[PDB]
Structures are given as C-alpha cells and as structure tokens.
Amino acid sequence: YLSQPRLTYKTVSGVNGPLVILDHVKFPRYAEIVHLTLPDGTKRSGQVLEVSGSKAVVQVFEGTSGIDAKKTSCEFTGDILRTPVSEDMLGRVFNGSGKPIDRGPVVLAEDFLDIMGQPINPQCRIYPEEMIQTGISAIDGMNSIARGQKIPIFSAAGLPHNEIAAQICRQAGLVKKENFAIVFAAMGVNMETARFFKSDFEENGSMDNVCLFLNLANDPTIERIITPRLALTTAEFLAYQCEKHVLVILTDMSSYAEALREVSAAREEVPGRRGFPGYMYTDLATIYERAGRVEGRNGSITQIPILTMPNDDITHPIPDLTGYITEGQIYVDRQLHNRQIYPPINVLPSLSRLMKSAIGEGMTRKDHADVSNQLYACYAIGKDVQAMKAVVGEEALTSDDLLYLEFLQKFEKNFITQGPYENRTVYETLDIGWQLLRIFPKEMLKRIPQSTLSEFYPR
Amino acid sequence: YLSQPRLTYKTVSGVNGPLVILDHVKFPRYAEIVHLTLPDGTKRSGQVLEVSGSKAVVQVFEGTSGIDAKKTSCEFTGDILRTPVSEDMLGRVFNGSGKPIDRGPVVLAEDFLDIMGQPINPQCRIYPEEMIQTGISAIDGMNSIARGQKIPIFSAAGLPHNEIAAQICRQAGLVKKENFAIVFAAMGVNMETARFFKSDFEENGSMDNVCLFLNLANDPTIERIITPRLALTTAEFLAYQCEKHVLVILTDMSSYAEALREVSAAREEVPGRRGFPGYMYTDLATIYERAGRVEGRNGSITQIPILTMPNDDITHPIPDLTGYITEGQIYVDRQLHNRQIYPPINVLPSLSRLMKSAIGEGMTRKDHADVSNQLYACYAIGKDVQAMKAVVGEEALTSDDLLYLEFLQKFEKNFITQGPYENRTVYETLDIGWQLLRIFPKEMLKRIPQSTLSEFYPR
Amino acid sequence: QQKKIQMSNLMNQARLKVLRARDDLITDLLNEAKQRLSKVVKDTTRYQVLLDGLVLQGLYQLLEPRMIVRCRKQDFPLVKAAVQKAIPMYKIATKKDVDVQIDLEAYLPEDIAGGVEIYNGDRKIKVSNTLESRLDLIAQQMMPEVRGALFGANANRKFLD
Amino acid sequence: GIKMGGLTSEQYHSQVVGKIGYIARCMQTIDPENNLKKIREDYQDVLIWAEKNYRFEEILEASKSGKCPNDLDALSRRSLILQELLRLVSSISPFKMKLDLIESQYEKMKQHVNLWKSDYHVKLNQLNQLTDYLKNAAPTPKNNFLRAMTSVLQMQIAQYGITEDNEGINQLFKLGLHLLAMANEKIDEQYHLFKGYVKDQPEESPFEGILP
Amino acid sequence: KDRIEIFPSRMAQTIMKARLKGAQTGRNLLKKKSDALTLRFRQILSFVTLDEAIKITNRRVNAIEHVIIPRIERTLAYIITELDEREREEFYRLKKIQEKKKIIKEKSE
Amino acid sequence: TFGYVHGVSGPVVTACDMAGAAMYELVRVGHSELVGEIIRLEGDMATIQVYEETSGVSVGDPVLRTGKPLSVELGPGIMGAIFDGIQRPLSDISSQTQSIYIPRGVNVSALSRDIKWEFIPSKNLRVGSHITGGDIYGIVNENSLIKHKIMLPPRSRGSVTYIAPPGNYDASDVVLELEFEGVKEKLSMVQVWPVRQVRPVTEKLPANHPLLTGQRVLDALFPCVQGGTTAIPGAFGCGKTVISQSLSKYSNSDVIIYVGCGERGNEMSEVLRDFPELTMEVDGKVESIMKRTALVANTSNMPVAAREASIYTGITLSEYFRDMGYHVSMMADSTSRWAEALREISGRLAEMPADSGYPAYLGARLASFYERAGRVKCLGNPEREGSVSIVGAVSPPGGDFSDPVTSATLGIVQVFWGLDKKLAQRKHFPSVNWLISYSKYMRALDEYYDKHFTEFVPLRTKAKEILQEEEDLAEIVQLVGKASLAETDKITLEVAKLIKDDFLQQNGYTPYDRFCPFYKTVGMLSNMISFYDMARRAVETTAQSDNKITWSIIREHMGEILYKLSSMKFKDPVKDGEAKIKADYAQLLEDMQNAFRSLE
C-alpha cells in the first residue's frame, strides 16, 4: 500500500490527438495511470507515455474529444497498472480494461500483479511432457499439443478460426487416462463475434472453467495491447500460484499487431519493416514466452495464439515473426473450407515439434506415435495418387493406388471432418485412425512396427 | 611549416554514435585531425567532418567507446592528415593507421603528402600503351592488362581470388620480347589471409619490394576507409616522385564499402542503393583514379581493386559502381570453381577497356585482336547451346551446334585451366586460341577477316 | 437439448448471485467503516491529531511556494492550529519557505466526514486529502487482506510469489 | 598503435620484463646452488639483470631504451627451453638426476627446431598427467599400481632422460597411461595388466629399492 | 528475357507467387505424366508414338524447370529487392522529418 | 557517483547531472537499479538505454554510474554455472529468491562471495619479484577436471609486494598486491574485462591440430581444427543434437561453452535439462559434463541487450580460459537469433537499415566475432598455448541461404557441416548432406596427417571421389536400372553404398559406437578403399575377352569379405584394444586381397 493522498492537476499544456500534455506535475512516473474529469463530468482513463521533467504526456484510453486546456482535471494514482487477480474471476467475462461486463461484481482481489510481469527464469523451466487433448481429431491424432508448448493457428481472413477457437474452449481438457482452466482473450473482435464467444461459452456449460476477455474492434486500441497481458497475468496467477493447468488462447494477434503499430505512431517512432515497430519481435516474445512448466510446481501454461495471415502470405512479418518463436503450427487452409470440410485444417503443412514427447505410453496410448506417422504418410500418398489419377485416369491405376484413394476420401470425411459439437477424445481419435488404417493390408503399413500391428491392427 | 602551438580542449559538447562534437573551438578548420586522450590514458584520433561557428564534429577512428564528456582531452593538429612517406617503406609492414607493426621504427619521412591527394591534370595524363604479361591465358589473351590500367577481380566468398592476386604478383612481366614495387592493402580480412600474402611475398623472394598495410577483421572499421588512401599515397610518392613502377592491390573493396556505409548511416547521409551513400561513386573514384601514367615521368601505378560480390550479385552497388569507374574486370565465378578449374576466370562477363590499344602489330602479334573476338563469339555461343540442349536434348542439335560444345569443352580445359604455377606467354596463348578456332571451318569464323584466316588458320 | 442450456444458465446466474451477495457484504462493511469514522471525527483531541497529520502530509506532497487550505467551516479552529504547527515542521524538513493560507471564503461541503483539501497558490493543483478519500484509497489497497480475513484463505493457492 | 604482433608498445616491453624475471626465477629454482655452469652462461644476458632491485620500472626503461635483450621471439623460445628443463627435473622430483644428464638433455632441446611440438614435449605432458593424477588419489588397487609404476618411471627418467629414446621407458609409458584410462569399476583387467608388467619386466624384483 | 518485366509492386509480388505455384504444379503434373508414359514404354519394350510422347513431354517439363521457373524466381527476387529499396527511402525521409520537427521545437523554446 | 533521471520516453531514460560518464558505460537506473547503458551524451545529460521494463521510473530517481562498461566477471565459480547474456547467474537467482521469475532489477553478483576456495600459490614467486600481464601466480582447485588458474589481469604489471599464503580464500579477499611506479593495486581472485574488448595474446598461431570429434562423418571427410571456425545449420529435423553431445562429451578440448542467443523457452529448457545429465569417462571415473562446462542461457523474451550481448559474453568467457592454456570449444546455438536481437537494437536506435533490413555493420560484427577464435600463444611468462574453436549454428527464416546472416557467416567460417532433414527422415545419422558440406582446413592439417597416419589423405580423397561419382551416376542408373552399365560403375555404386551404410553412418545409441577413435576411422576406410581398388583392378585387368571378372562374380564369390567389411564398425574400443582392433583389420585386409587373388 502507499497511503499517500493523490494529486489532481488542472494544468494542461496542450492536447494532440490521443495525447494530453500536462504541466507542473510532481515527480511523475512512466506508465502511471491517471483519471481525467471533463467539464461535463465525464471520466476517462489514460496512461503516461512520456515524462520529460514536469511535462507529463498521457495517452487517453477513450477519445480525447471534449477535453480543454482550462478546466479538465487529471488525477494521478501514484502507481502503474496492476491487475486484481483471484481464483474467483474464473467464470467471469471482462472487457479489455479488466472491468466486468457480465453484470457481476468487480473482482474481489486476492493480489495485484504487474501485467508486464517478468521473464521466467530458464533454470527452472521444465521441458513439456504430458498432452492436453483438444477434442479435435485433426490436432489430437496428427499434431497434438504438449502440456507446455506454444503452437499458433495460422488462418487466412474469412476462414472459421473463431469457430474452431470456441470449439477448443468447449471441448479441451486433460486426457483422463478439476485442475484445468482456460483463459481466452479476443483482441479487436467485432460485436457479432464477441457475442458468439460469450453466448456459446455460457450456453454449453463451459464457463465454469473459462476466463473470458473481450476487446472489441471499436474499443480503445491501447486497451487491446494490455488485454493479452491481463489474460496472461491471470494465467500466471492461476497456473503457478494455484497449482493448475491453464490453456491460454490469444485470438487475432494480427489485430493486436495493428494496435501496437498505432501505439508506436503515438510515440512518433519511425516505422520499421512493413510499417511495424523494430521491437515487434521482442514484444511478441514478451507475450508468447510467458508459458511452460516450472520446477517444483504442478501447474503449467500452454498457448494457442491464433493469427490471420494478411493476403494469405505466410511470409508477412506477423506470421513470420510469430512462427520464428513458436514450436510448430496448426495452419487452417482455404481449399478444405471451400470443400465444406469442418474443421478445414490441412495436416500436411502443420507440425507440432513437441508431439514426440506429448504422446506415448503413460500419457495417451502405446500406439499413438505409430498411428500418426502412418496416417500422415497415407494421406500424403493419397494426395499424390489423386494427382496421378487426374492425369492417367482410373483405369490406369493399380489396386494399391485405389486403396490410397479410398483412404484419402474416407480420411477427410471420417477423420478430419468432425462438426462443431462432436467431442472426440484422444482414444476415439486413435480408434478412428485404426478404422482407416485397416483399409490396408498389414504389409503396406510400413511405418508401424509388427509388434504394434499384432496388438492393435485386428478387430 | 606550422610554428604556432596547438590548442588542447576539454570542451566536448556531446557524443552521438561514432561522432564526438566539440564546442568552444577557436577557428575550426574543416578536415583537420584531432588527437584525443580518454580518462584512462588511451589515445585516439579523428577528423573534423563538419565545422559551424564554434562547434566541430570529430569522427574518431578507433571508436567512441569509453569517450568521456568532462575528462576527455582533445588537441587540434592544425592540418589535414598528411602522412610521412619515404622510399624505404618498401619492405615494411604497416597497420591501417599508418603505423609500423613489424617491430621496426616509425617512418623517417622524406616528405608529407596529403592523404586526400590531388587529381592528376588530364592534360598531362598520358594514355597507357604498354602491356603487362600476367602469364594467365584467360587474361593475357582475351582481357589484356596494360601498365597503368585499373582491373579489379570480381569474386565471391570462398573463391580463390587471393591465390590469383598472389600469382599475378610473381609472374607479372612485360611482353616486350622488370621489378614492380607492390603495395598491398589488406583490409577487412582475417589473419590467415594477411599471412597468406605476407608468406607468399617472402616465398617469391620479393619482400624487399613489398609494402603492406594491414587492417584486420578485428581492427576498427573507420580506419578501413583510409587504408586504401595510405597505400595509394605511398604509391604516388614512389611512382610520380621516384619513377618506380608500382602495383597496388586492394583486398576485398567490399570491406571498404561496408565501412563507408556505416559512416554514411551514422551521419544520416542520403542513401542510394542498398543503403550505401549517394556519393559512393565519387568516393570510390577518389580511390580508384589514383592510377595511370603521367607524361614526362617514367613511373606508373597499376591497380587491382579485388572485391567480393555480395551474393554473387553482379549488379550490387559495389561491383556496379566499380564497373563504371575501372577499365573493366577479370571476374571469377563459382561455376568454374565448382568444377576444380583454376584459375576460375569467366571471360564472358569480363572486359579490358584498354585492350584495343595494348595488343596487335608492334605490341604482341597482329592477329591478337582477331583471335580474341572470335573466341568470345564461340565461347558465348557454346554457352547458348548448353542453354538450349538442357531442354531439347542432344538429339535436337545439329553439327553446327556440336562444334560449339566441342569448342566450349576444349576451351575451358585447354585455355582457362592452367594451375597456380603455370606461366604461359602471350604468344603461346594466341597459338592455343588458334588450336581451338581450328575446331571450326573457315566460313564459320565470321569475326576474323580473310586477310587473317589465310595466314594463321592453315598452320 | 434445451434442458442443457437451461441448466447452464441457472448455474451461471447462481454463481453471479452469490458473488454479488459477497460484494454487498464488502459494500456494507465499508459503509459501516464510514459511520465509525464519522464517530471518530465527532471527537476533538483525536480529530485534531488527524488534522495535524493530514495537513503535514498534504503540504509535503504538494511542495509549492504558496498553498491554500480548504476545510469545513466548523473545523476551522482545529485546522488553524494544524497549519500553525505544520508550517515550522514543514520548513525544517524541506528547507523551503512556503506561505500557507487558509481559505476563509470557500469551505468544503458539510456532509463530508472530515479532512482537508490542499490547493497551490493558483488553485490549479489540489491534494485529495479528505478523510473519505483516504479511507477509500486505503480500503482498496488493503482489500486482498479484507477478503481473506472475512471469507477465508484460498485453499488452492500454494505459492504467494 | 605500434601493435607489435598482438601487443602494444607498453605491453610488449612489459612482457619482456616479465620473461626476464621469469628466467631468473627459473634458474635459481632449478639450480639454486649454481652448479649448471654451461646452462647459466647461455642466459647470462638475462641473468645479469637479476639480483638487482629495479622496481620493474628501471629494467622496463632498459628494455625501451634497448639495453636489455628485448627481442620477444628469442626470449619466448629461450624461456620455453628452460622451463621445459624444469619440468623434466621437477616431475621426477623424488629422484636426483645427474648434472651431466641435465646438461645433455638441455643441449638436445636447444638444438631442436620446434621444441613445443617435439616428442620430448609430449612425453613430458604424459608424465605430468600421470604424476598430477596421483597428487590427490584414494587408496585402491588401481592407484597403488599407478603409484608403484610411476616411481619406477621416475627412477628410469632420472637415469636415461627423455630425448634419448629407450624402449623400456616407452613401454612403461604405454602401460601406465593404459591403466590410468582404464575403467575404475573393472578390477580383473587392471590386475592382469599390472601382473603383465611385473612378469615381463626384465628384472626379478622391479620395485625393490624403488618404493618403501 | 531474364525477367517478366513487371514493375516492382506488392501486386506484382502476389502475382509472381501465384504464377510460381502454378508453374511448380505444372512441372510436377507433367513429370507424373512422363513417369506414367515411361513405365508403359518400358513395359512394352503403337510404340514410336510413346517415344515421341515422352520426348515431347520431357521437353516441356525441362523448359518449365530450366527456362520458365528460373525466370519467375529471378523476377520475384527482383521485385522483393526493389520493394525493400522503396521502403528504405521512405524510412530516410521520415527520419529527417522527425529530426526537423525536433529542431523546430527547440527553436520555439 | 549518482545522477538523476530527467525523463523517460519508453525504454530510453534521460539523465541529468551525469557529466562524468563515458559512452557505453553502465548505469543502474532508479530505486530498483535497472540495468542500462549510456549511448548519446550531451552536456551533463546522458541518454540511457534500459534493458528491462521502465514502468514505474520517476523523474528525480537516482542513477548510479558504474565505471566499467559492459563486462564479464571472471574468476573461480565460473564453471558449472548458467548465466544470462549479461552475466547474471540464473542458478543463484532462482535459488536465493525461491522464485520462478528473474526479478526486475535483480542484482546478484556473477560469482558468489560466500565460497571459500582452495588456493595454492605458484610457490615460484617471491615478494620483490617482477610479474607481468598474463602471468599465473596461483591455482584454485575447483574440481577433478579443470584447474582454475589465477592470472594477473591484462594491462597490469609491476613488482609483487604481497603474496597470500596457501589457504582458503573467497572472491572478496586480497590474494596478490603489486606496486607499479609507486601505485599499489590490490587484486582478488576475480578480474573484470569489458565484453566488447579482445583479450590480448602474445601471437596468433596457425591451427594445425585436428578437433577430434567422435563421428566418422564430420571428421574423415570434413575435418575441423582446434581454433577453427565452422557453421552448422539448425533445423528441427537436422539432428543437431548428435554434434552437440558428441562435441561436448568426447571432444579432446578441455572446456565446453554452450551459448544461447535467444531461442524458444522450451528449447532452452531442453539444453538446460540434457547437459546436466551428460557424462564422460575421464581417468576411468564417470564425471558429469557440468564440471568442465559453462553455459549461457537466453530465451527470446530476454532483454534484447542480453540476447545481442550473449554471443560476446560467451566468447569472452572462452578467451578467459584460452589464456589459461586450455582448448575451448564454444557453440552458439543460433547466430540467427543473435542477428535478430542486433536488428532490433538498430531499429530502436532509428538507424538507417541495409540489406534485408539488417544493420549496415552486420558483416563487420560477425567478422570481428569469428576473428577472435584461433590458436594463440598466450600472455605471461609460462609460455603456454591454447585455442578457441567456434561451432556456431545458423537458422535463417525459411531455411534459405540468401539471408545476409547465413550468407555472411558462410563467407567467414572455413568449415560448413551442412545437415539435412531428408537423411533424418530415412533414419540416417549423423544427418550430413555430404555434397554441400566442405572444409577449408584440409591443407592446414596435411602436416599432422602425414606425420602421424600417412595413408589418411589419399583415402579421404578417394572416398569423396567415390561418393561424388555415385551421385554423378544417379541419372544413368535411373534411365538404365544397372543393366546397360559398366561393371566398374557397379563397383562404384555398390561400394559407395557400403561406405554410406557402414562408415559414414554411425549409431550413437550403441555402447560400441559411442566414439570412434581416429585410428579406427582410418582403419575402416582403408579396408573399404583397398577393396574398391582391388575390385576395380580385378574387373579392368580381365575385361578384355574370353574370361572376365564381373561384380556378380565378385559379390557371390567373396560375400564373407563384404560381410566382414560391414562388421568392422562393431570393434568396441572399450573392450578391444588398439593392437587387437588393428590386428583384426589387418586380417580383413589380407583375407580381402586373397579373395580377389583367387579370381586371377
């Protein structure tokens, strides 16, 4: 606590777009939170971005319209933005500023954390082990998410990245061969989609384990920047202090990146590559890397950042800088979507670098690794045979080629195509895999050891 | 001379990158040298690149790390970097700052010359009309070297351009059927490269006629843009005051360009291409054009500004601007090196802008020019035939095309391939030319007049 | 199908109902604290001590060459003493001669439990040093300890770092 | 920036003063009785500066002025030879070497083109590996075998030296190093290896009079 | 000749990437056609028509690989380089604008 | 020594009353003592770049000026510790706080001052003797492997006035006192050296002694030399673990340094978890690798100054031991991660960008980095020698070689151990591409190889010729099926396979193949090439008419010889000694020549 009376200033040097420049401010802090009172009694929030002597420069969260240089007062809190956190806030819905928008009370805090936090000391970081099943076969039997990795979903604009994200929140959980929570943050979301998330989470009973942050497209752009920090700040409290596993989903990081560029312009910084700040790399790492396991504690944080690829070009700095510091990718395609496949996830370009540790005896099932590798080869071959068929015709194909075409057609129809309300656990996903693999005789399943085939292949 | 005591200042205004800005300076002189001492006794030097009123901007050669603001002591020499030069610098080894590094004494000057030099009056400049016999058929035949000519070797990282330059140093003579003083500026290179040349010069038994200037990869980057001027300034003394024929070799000029680019960025100068200063051409001309014979004096300076082409890009500003200034290039590539061809000299993209006058009746042999031009035609066509045959197949070729493939194959192994110690005369090179030209019937040798074919072709 | 949705809405609203009830308990407790502080300012000697402190802390935070103290009219006799004491203590601590006046024309609304507001010479900077503002400021900063004391510690929280 | 080799002007002359003091220290350390007259003479130009108090600074000025033998490369080679001779006699310290053999080994080193890369240098490096290991070694069959074998090795070097190649010493080097690298867990192999040495040694009592 | 000669732009970059993907797909599909013809050809070894079909298909595949795609890749790399050059001159001007604004502000104080 | 904060514009803090400050000095800003550096100076004001978050810094906060620029603290206790890129012990921060986070403004001394180290003086020095820079005046006994030699700091000299007696001292005590021109300097066991400064040596020597890694491939065909510089691609599927473990476990170097630059959190964990579990036999005892290793850990979310400085902190630690006479092998996990950190700083400083957005000086910084490696003659009278090798990895975005960072690196390093993913997919390890990989030290090592092994050089030449021809024949085989093919080409194809299978391929998870001594590597290749030559001669000398030898005859006739050749990799150096393995290889050579002899 400070127990120091706050100072309120009526001295304003000028106002320039989103910024208000104050004067005669006593020992101002950088990143200090202040509150403005306009002549009409309207209150606004803001944050100090520059303090050059007594000339404090504050960015106003809301619009600066209506602010004068004679009557507007600025109350200083004497501190920076610290988020009230508790276990009870799980099951609540908040806006970007951390305020409730679910008609519930303000959070009754157990502590206050600096939302910027600190990096996790690498000496106490534990390599990812067990798996967190998502319920979506395309990313459980092919590229599973290890309990501690960070694997993004890259999508083009217009693809159902928000519907999949909502499905993961409803279905995700532990393998279960009470301590699992999901923190969901949507940045720059439009009103129709924001309603979708809120209503879909409430109706299906999942809300008890979801902490939802909604930053709407028409909300202040600076609030969009702290939104993912508040989500992770909660995740760190829940995960590391309350000994539980937290799945954090950061939706539309591309909208975050645009908000970050806006803040950079407010500081009159010269834009870097493709208009983005030269520090975009470390800013994404600052958010992304606040995850993983820690020594001596039973909690964990995983992340599934979701990013829209501008112009569907994976080379763009946003997916490029993200992927360069994440472990593999899910990758949602367009061809599968136009073919009316849901989920439209393309297994050939996807990768989960930690899958080798996520799956196996004692974590999922003995045959997990073998089924995945054989299915991947079979799908890749089926696509190759399909390309051949288009040139040589059906009569030019042999029996083995026909089996690969049968697999290809049934793989997409049975294994990848799921529906938004069918929850397929890791064991059902593997059983579906075997149903497709039993299309082939044993001798064609070259990537599955004979011991595995004898145990699982028949029946 | 300068009899007035020099002033010492402790008036440093501030430091911004590599530039130390002084105030309260009495009558600042542009392009004067300042000596500065750091609080710990370290001595460094720099040059005034700007004066305004009582202020002066000093660029420090060694660097600005550790430069203080209150204890830094600077003195103004009162003149430009004029450097001591003497005949007995041959056989000495210097660093990029002009100081000895061979455990010998400092230079006992015969005079002091302005490192910036002076342009040679074009009315007294005498056009080069003498040929140097390099012993390399790839050069002596198709791209002759004149005494006073500027011919860099365009190369790429990993190629033996250092071996070619070393070879040229030993077996470079005259075709008048001679000991050149060599000045070798080793800048931006590792120890092994500098030791390679130093050892070769001793192995050749010519070290008493070699002056070295070293500025290694671990030396300051600002000294790397005076080293060439130090080498050439010495060359000018030897060539134009002592009538000694001098060969000046500048190692990877790209380290000069990169050192210059760093200075350009530091001073926020107008860029041209790839971030290089818009005046890069003018600066390079200042270095390159210190070459050629002068009427009425028996000396000469010949330059070989070897440079590495970044990413083998022949249009990169470095080879581009050099190509505009120098009289052509020798140019080596990877396509020859990857086949263990030495020297890996590719004649097609090469040229010598003085060749037309240094060959022929009274110089070498009257058929020289005719043989070269036809060899260029046959070599380029053979490359064109390979470009076609790669797609259409050998069966699509006729006898008119196979002849050029036979020529091309025999040309590269007989004419270009020689070995590090194969020293051929210019007359032997032409005879080889004819042996390759005799692959074709007279009617196809369309670059050679019948007044030449009738005499030489029958043999 | 609709039965599942009904169950979700009932459980989610039930959670909010109990959370709101807990927030009412905090609100009622804070309101009771305000009534208890009102009883304190009804004193004389204890209240004068509060005023001595409040004036000193206000002056030390504002650090201006001229200051105006605004208070409730009925508290003027006590504030006058507080300023007369605050001045020589301020000067010794800060080594700055500050002219501190009391506003005899404008007064704080009589419904405020007590305390003072401090303005600089031009009335452009004010210190919110009333009792009600200080109580709200501290009650929020200390709130995490109020939660535990009243409702119990979080049984699932094992690390406080 | 005279940058003579890797050193600046002050560092160059400082390293020269150091090497000269070092040779003086090595000479008194190796031959405190001044018995090795021929070897001392080879260093007279640097020993003449010894036994004087120059507070570093006066001998440093002598180096800058050119009164000292300030060639850095000549001192490097000459210093290495002396300290390698010290290693020869130091690593066998339990035994006394004859003065005539010390001078003989010295002359053979002085004549060597590149002593650092010689078999002489390597043999001393292997010896120091074996003698340093034993400085802090627990009692155990392996370490008792190595200690007994090392004492014989030191006894032989004291008599034959290192440059005068001898099959007996070379074979003992191989057996000692092979045991040293042998797994500590394996007992039967190190027992058979030691027993092989004892029975193959030309004499009947290889350690009698060598160790207590 | 060496490049398709499309003026550097983000639009051209997008077109070239789509054009490259098309060329790569054509190369692979024609290569599969050739492989299918080669297997049938070897199995028989209406014969000379297969030898001509293989040479014609392989010639087209070789041109895509040795002429058309290299040219698309050179064009794409050219566009990418020129686009970064335009980005740089924009950076330069913006830097000087920010410095001039700072200088103007100091003069006003 | 204090100034005050004048203002904050983000990560950049402007100080006032800071006249006595040098550029690239160090400051501790604010009451949390935030780490930063001074870049621009003007008057008595300074512009400070703060590495950590500046939230909460007030105008008027103190700034503490630290005289030393970014420097590495060097002394006992350096070994076995994991450091931040700016030399902050992570194993102490996590253990002195009981936290999982690195505290903001954390201030833990690089080397703990609560350890009483065992220090033994050289016993050769006396009070009144002359000592110069680089001289060793005593040794600290850290562990059974590496002796930590205490050197006089460079740029210091004088007369010795006090020598501490043998005993237990911590890093805060005084061990040696020396006086130069009346100025007395008190030295402890710890020296400080600016990280951007190159530690001086007496002379830089050529690198001639091989780096004896345990792999048959990446040795026989593509040698590295102590003091040399190489590059290794870093891709998920490349199998880089094989080199890291083989180099750190069995190398003939003395000290291993592993440097992270700014990798994924989980990747840093994998390195930190694997390394402590690695062991090697030394004197017959199994010792932990961490007793002769030091590690610098930097994740992508570490302060950019540390990620950029990490690479220089590592090599400064490397040179420190280089000056002791040790051979040091440093691996930079990803120099691409470093280059990214460098570009970020250039961006923050609003510098004009150059090639692909990187700073104009990228090449100059990389060139001066690698130039610091090499075999040197050390400073100090002990006339000792040592070396630093660099085996830094490159991982450009997209896997392309056009990125200036990989292109510049390849123009600097003399060896490239190009790895591939296709080989890993085929389960062929180590995953060496062969056609892309090269080594430019082959000439430098010719003196060593001639002196000690003689036949190695023609064997590696023939081996590369066989492998290259196998590739050259690929088109002929595809269009022919080995039918219309010369018998001499069949020898090349089938023998090249033998080489690829039972020589270049190595299985590091088997106890017999953990490490292949060089004498075994050359033994295996000698017999395979001798077979090649015998098979070529058997066919060529009989290929005229009437009665000729073919591969079908050779393969069927002496199948036991081809089996014995394949079996050669199973000769376990731990159980079968040098004489036994050579003897068995000699027997195969004789049996092999006689097998062909029976055909003529």
Curated annotation (Swiss-Prot), chains A, B:
Keywords of this protein's UniProt record, alphabetized? ATP-binding, Cell membrane, Cytoplasm, Cytoplasmic vesicle, Hydrogen ion transport, Ion transport, Membrane, Nucleotide-binding, Synapse, Transport
Give GO terms for biological process: ATP metabolic process; regulation of cellular pH; synaptic vesicle lumen acidification; vacuolar acidification
According to the UniProt record, one GO cellular component term is: extrinsic component of synaptic vesicle membrane
Q: Record's InterPro entries?
A: ATP-synt_VA_C, ATPase_a/bsu_AS, ATPase_F1/V1/A1_a/bsu_N, ATPase_F1/V1/A1_a/bsu_nucl-bd, ATPase_V1-cplx_bsu, P-loop_NTPase, V-ATPase_su_B/beta
Q: Which GO terms describe its molecular function?
A: ATP binding; proton-transporting ATPase activity, rotational mechanism
- Similarity comment: Belongs to the ATPase alpha/beta chains family.
Q: What does this protein do?
A: Non-catalytic subunit of the V1 complex of vacuolar(H+)-ATPase (V-ATPase), a multisubunit enzyme composed of a peripheral complex (V1) that hydrolyzes ATP and a membrane integral complex (V0) that translocates protons. V-ATPase is responsible for acidifying and maintaining the pH of intracellular compartments and in some cell types, is targeted to the plasma membrane, where it is responsible for acidifying the extracellular environment.
Q: Enumerate the PANTHER family for this protein.
A: V-TYPE PROTON ATPASE SUBUNIT B (PTHR43389), V-TYPE PROTON ATPASE SUBUNIT B, BRAIN ISOFORM (PTHR43389:SF5)
According to the record's subunit comment, the protein's assembly and interactions are: V-ATPase is a heteromultimeric enzyme made up of two complexes: the ATP-hydrolytic V1 complex and the proton translocation V0 complex. The V1 complex consists of three catalytic AB heterodimers that form a heterohexamer, three peripheral stalks each consisting of EG heterodimers, one central rotor including subunits D and F, and the regulatory subunits C and H. The proton translocation complex V0 consists of the proton transport subunit a, a ring of proteolipid subunits c9c'', rotary subunit d, subunits e and f, and the accessory subunits ATP6AP1/Ac45 and ATP6AP2/PRR.
- According to UniProt, the name of this protein is V-type proton ATPase subunit B, brain isoform
Question: Source species, please?
Answer: Rattus norvegicus (Rat)
Curated annotation (Swiss-Prot), chain C:
What does the subunit comment say? V-ATPase is a heteromultimeric enzyme made up of two complexes: the ATP-hydrolytic V1 complex and the proton translocation V0 complex. The V1 complex consists of three catalytic AB heterodimers that form a heterohexamer, three peripheral stalks each consisting of EG heterodimers, one central rotor including subunits D and F, and the regulatory subunits C and H. The proton translocation complex V0 consists of the proton transport subunit a, a ring of proteolipid subunits c9c'', rotary subunit d, subunits e and f, and the accessory subunits ATP6AP1/Ac45 and ATP6AP2/PRR.
Q: Which residues of the full protein are shown?
A: 66 to 226 of 226
Q: Name one GO molecular function term.
A: ATPase binding
Residues crossing the lipid bilayer are none
The record's disulfide annotation reads: none
Main subcellular location of this protein, as a coarse class: membrane
Task: Respond yes or no to whether keyword Amino-acid biosynthesis is given for this record.
Answer: no
Q: In which tissues is it expressed?
A: Expressed in brain (at protein level).
Family assignment?
Belongs to the V-ATPase E subunit family.
Protein name in the entry: V-type proton ATPase subunit E 1
The record's GO CC annotations read:
apical plasma membrane; clathrin-coated vesicle membrane; cytoplasm; cytosol; endosome; extrinsic component of synaptic vesicle membrane; microvillus; vacuolar proton-transporting V-type ATPase, V1 domain
Q: How does it sit in the membrane?
A: Peripheral membrane protein
Q: Which UniProt keywords apply?
A: Acetylation, Cell membrane, Cytoplasmic vesicle, Hydrogen ion transport, Ion transport, Membrane, Phosphoprotein, Synapse, Transport
Entry keyword ATP-binding: no
The protein's location, in the record's own words, is:
Apical cell membrane; Cytoplasmic vesicle, Secretory vesicle, Synaptic vesicle membrane; Cytoplasmic vesicle, Clathrin-coated vesicle membrane
Q: What does this protein do?
A: Subunit of the V1 complex of vacuolar(H+)-ATPase (V-ATPase), a multisubunit enzyme composed of a peripheral complex (V1) that hydrolyzes ATP and a membrane integral complex (V0) that translocates protons. V-ATPase is responsible for acidifying and maintaining the pH of intracellular compartments and in some cell types, is targeted to the plasma membrane, where it is responsible for acidifying the extracellular environment.
Query: What Gene Ontology terms for biological process does this UniProt record contain?
Result: proton transmembrane transport; synaptic vesicle lumen acidification
